[PDB]
Amino acid sequence: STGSATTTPIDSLDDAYITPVQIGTPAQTLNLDFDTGSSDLWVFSSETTASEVDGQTIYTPSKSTTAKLLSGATWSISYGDGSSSSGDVYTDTVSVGGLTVTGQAVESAKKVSSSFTEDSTIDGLLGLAFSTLNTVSPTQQKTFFDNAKASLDSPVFTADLGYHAPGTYNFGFIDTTAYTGSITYTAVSTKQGFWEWTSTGYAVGSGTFKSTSIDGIADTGTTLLYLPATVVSAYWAQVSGAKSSSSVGGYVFPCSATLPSFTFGVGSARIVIPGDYIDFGPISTGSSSCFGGIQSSAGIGINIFGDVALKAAFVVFNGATTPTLGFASK
Numbered sequence: 001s002t003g004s005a006t007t008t009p010i011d012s013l014d015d016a017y018i019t020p021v022q023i024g025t026p027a028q029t030l031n032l033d034f035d036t037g038s039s040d041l042w043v044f045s046s047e048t049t050a051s052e053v054d055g056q057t058i059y060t061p062s063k064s065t066t067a068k069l070l071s072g073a074t075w076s077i078s079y080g081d082g083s084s085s086s087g088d089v090y091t092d093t094v095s096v097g098g099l100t101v102t103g104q105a106v107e108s109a110k111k112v113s114s115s116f117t118e119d120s121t122i123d124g125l126l127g128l129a130f131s132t133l134n135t136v137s138p139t140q141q142k143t144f145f146d147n148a149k150a151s152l153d154s155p156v157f158t159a160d161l162g163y164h165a166p167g168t169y170n171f172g173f174i175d176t177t178a179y180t181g182s183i184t185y186t187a188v189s190t191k192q193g194f195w196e197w198t199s200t201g202y203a204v205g206s207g208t209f210k211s212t213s214i215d216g217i218a219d220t221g222t223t224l225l226y227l228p229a230t231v232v233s234a235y236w237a238q239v240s241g242a243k244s245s246s247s248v249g250g251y252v253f254p255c256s257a258t259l260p261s262f263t264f265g266v267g268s269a270r271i272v273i274p275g276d277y278i279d280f281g282p283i284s285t286g287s288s289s290c291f292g293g294i295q296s297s298a299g300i301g302i303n304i305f306g307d308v309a310l311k312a313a314f315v316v317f318n319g320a321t322t323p324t325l326g327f328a329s330k
């Protein structure tokens, strides 16, 4: 089997991408944030605290003839951005663009933090990192990709995020028309439960490529590109007026600037992030100071190849016996 679904940016800045997911019988369609940096499929629901729901579409398990309460199971997750959610668990039929998983764990939120409540366009998350990170207790549950894997024509999923435009998540196949040149595959460590790999280096605009090992995670659930301070300083030093602002919480730059591109290495291959992809607009409404799309990972503990980097590439998340990541220009 295969699945194919369109992913759409939630706003004019590509702050996040939402993909429609069918849950239950009859189908209840929710727009989920596909996240390769986490492993829980959770949704806003009929059980979520009323004051914590502000415009999201909710899953109502009582209206699904295939929903079964997973007895005694609870979940609770805290994300790197400080956001959190928790609740109970149902098993139900979940479909993504024609691909169906019966008995998928659907984690129903009873509580969500303010960051989730304020994003009316995100109805929940669909985790695509390794099932070892799944928070369901006392019986850990599998991701949608893990459950579909055996059935897929090829044990892979692909992320093709658009810049200011819709993109696609495919399951079980590689669309050879979606990229240019070849896909370069690179080793993955699953020790931390992430799609963790090692970039071979970087270039800033037309600058000379620096060969240097950058360990990081391919994370569709993180908006920006988080890299070592030395790398991020070398990037923003090419932008007149750019500076790291402690009050804003990162590098800001004059909105009148034309940003240089950023290249990252994948083996001998090179992915080029055009400069406009690094502009995240005014720091506050009406300001002429803009927020940078490349930020320091110093306070995180890990480098993150978020949407800023991934959207410049066709990315293969290869779930073969030994998982690998593939990158192609597009």
Ligand SMILES: NCCN1CCOCC1
Pocket: 010, 015, 016, 114, 115, 116, 118, 119
């Ligand atoms: N609610 C703050 C976080 N979100 C994250 C996704 O994009 C919009 C802003």
